Amino acid sequence: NSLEIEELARFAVDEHNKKENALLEFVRVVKAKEQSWKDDELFDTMYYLTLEAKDGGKKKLYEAKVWVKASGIVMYQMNFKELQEFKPV
């Protein structure tokens, strides 16, 4: 289950084609944004993708949101702590 931006965009197209019985053709990834959230001992990531696809042989632009649950997991033994700032208030 890869996390590369192009694979995520293709997942979006394949999932969209299946849900709405359409047949768009993936062309390119234009831009991507990622925001992450920590839930308990797991990590979640949201991907915001701008992509190129062909609807009727006509190239169009689409925006997709992909939610990845357990994109990461907490392992306490490997974490490394570093102090950046220490000041009185």
Binding site: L42, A70, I73
Partner: protein, 73 residues
Amino acid sequence: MQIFVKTLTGKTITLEVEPSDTIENVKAKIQDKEGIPPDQQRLIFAGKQLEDGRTLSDYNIQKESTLHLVLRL
């Protein structure tokens, strides 16, 4: 019903359960096979960590489902 539990080193253990079974009971079965105490056990299904109170059926776990096991050292 039979379900699969997979370790981070790729080893797979087979379990016998029923949908009514709680997560605490599944951890107990894992403890008997692998000698790991349930308190030190972490179970992941569908991108979520399973809570002790709920049952297998609550998470919509079915035959041939695979769960992921993580240890607390």
